[PDB]
Amino acid sequence: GDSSLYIILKKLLDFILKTGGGFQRVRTHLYGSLLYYLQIAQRPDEPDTLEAAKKTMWERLTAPEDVFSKLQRENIAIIESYGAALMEVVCRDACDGHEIGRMLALALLDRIVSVDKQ
Amino acid sequence: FVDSTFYLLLDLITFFDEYHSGHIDRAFDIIERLKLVPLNQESVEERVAAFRNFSDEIRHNLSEVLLATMNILFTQFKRLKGIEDRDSQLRSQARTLITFAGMIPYRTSGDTNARLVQME
Incomplete structure (x- = not known):
């Protein structure tokens, strides 16, 4: 389980919101770690998987598995808080500096994006 | 199996x-x-x-099975007022249960707050 990874994910969000780090270089690292974490959590699965899980829950006929959905929910809560704060930081940042760090931050924004889509 | x-x-x-x-x-x-x-x-x-x-x-x-046990076990074994009172059992039960809970806390949600009910 990438539970241990979860803690790093939290630290990353913390640093970003704080926007400490004179270096965007630092923030690029934070963005990269977050990107992998978001991607890692949902191994490529598509709506079919979600539908199957819901049915199984169907209702807990017996013992269901709803592990991946639960993991996504926890990620999304953490992310929310930290989120408003950090969204501000991530976008402004965007522009400038780092045309570089950019490659990293835009990718982070897009992954995040699916999840927390909605 | 399914029926069981x-x-x-x-x-x-x-x-x-x-x-x-x-x-x-x-x-x-x-x-x-x-x-x-x-x-x-x-x-x-x-x-x-x-x-x-x-x-x-x-x-x-x-x-829940645990903690239900440590509850009834607690409430039932409310220290009585003023004869055969075998408090010892319903006490040993908590002990065995706690060792049990102690062994599998990791494979459990993460509420060994059995401890709160356990003591007083």
């Missing part, structure tokens, strides 16, 4: 009905009948060996 888990779930449910709504004594009797939780001696560990084996449906339910 079914009955177990029903038994656990009847335990719920009677848990609260009083009937402390009855709850212990039924829980023991389940043969899930070590009432006897330090056989708590055998309860470990038979734990991982447990079906997914039950493996999940144990958390």
